Amino acid sequence: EDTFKVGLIVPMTGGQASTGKQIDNAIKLYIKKHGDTVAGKKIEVILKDDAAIPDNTKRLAQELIVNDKVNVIAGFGITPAALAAAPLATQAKVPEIVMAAGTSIITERSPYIVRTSFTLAQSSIIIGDWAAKNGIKKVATLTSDYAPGNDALAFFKERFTAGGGEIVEEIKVPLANPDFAPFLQRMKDAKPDAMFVFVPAGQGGNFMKQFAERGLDKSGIKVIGPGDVMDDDLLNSMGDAALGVVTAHMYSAAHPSAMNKEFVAAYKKEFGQRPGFMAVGGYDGIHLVFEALKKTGGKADGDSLIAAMKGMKWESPRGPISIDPETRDIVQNIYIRKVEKVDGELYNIEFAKFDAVKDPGKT
Ligand X SMILES: COc1cc(C(=O)[O-])ccc1O
Q: Which residues of 200-231 are buried (b: 16+ CB within 10 A; e: fewer)?
A: bbbbbbebbebbbebebbeeebbbbbbbbbbb
CB-nearer residue toward ligand X: 94 or 175: 175
Beta bridge partners of 38: 41
Distance separating alpha carbons of residues 320 and 19, to the nearest angstrom: 23
Q: How far is the CB of 152 from ligand X (least distance, A)?
A: 8
Q: How far is the CB of 219 from ligand X (least distance, A)?
A: 26
- 3 among annotated binding-site residues: no
Residue closer to ligand X by CB (options 155, 290) is: 155
Shortest Å, Cβ 182 to ligand X: 22
Type of residue at 195: M
DSSP of 95-122, one letter per residue?
A: -EEESS---GGGGGG-TTEEESS--HHH
- Confirm if 211 and 180 have CB atoms less than 8 A apart: yes
Between 19 and 327, name the residue whose CB sits nearer to ligand X: 19
- Closest residue to bound ligand X by CB: 200
Which one, 71 or 143, has the nearer CB to ligand X?
A: 143
To ligand X, the closest distance from the beta carbon of 201 in angstroms equals: 4
Residue 197 CB, shortest distance to ligand X, in Å, is 12
What percentage of the chain's residues is helix, strand, coil (to nearest 5)?
40, 25, 30
143 labeled binding residue: no
- Binding stretches for ligand X (CB under 6 A): 16, 19, 77-79, 100-103, 148, 200-201, 228
Interior angle at CA 114, CA 8 and CA 60, nearest 5 = 30
Q: Any known ligand binding at 102?
A: yes
Tell the smallest beta-carbon distance from residue 97 to ligand X (Å).
15
Is 146 marked as binding a ligand? yes
**For ligand X, the closer CB: 43 or 82:** 82
For ligand X, give the closer residue by CB, 19 or 71. 19
* DSSP state string for 299-350: --SHHHHHHHHTT-EEEETTEEEEE-TTT--EEEEEEEEEEEEETTEEEEEE
- Are 339 and 286 a contacting pair, CB within 8 Å? no
**Nearer to ligand X by C-beta: 70 or 99?**
99
DSSP strands (E only) in 162-280: 166-173, 194-198, 222-226, 246-249
112 is in an annotated binding site: no
To ligand X, the closest distance from the beta carbon of 16 in angstroms equals 5
Show binding-site residues for 3,4-dihydroxybenzoate: 79, 102, 146, 201, 228
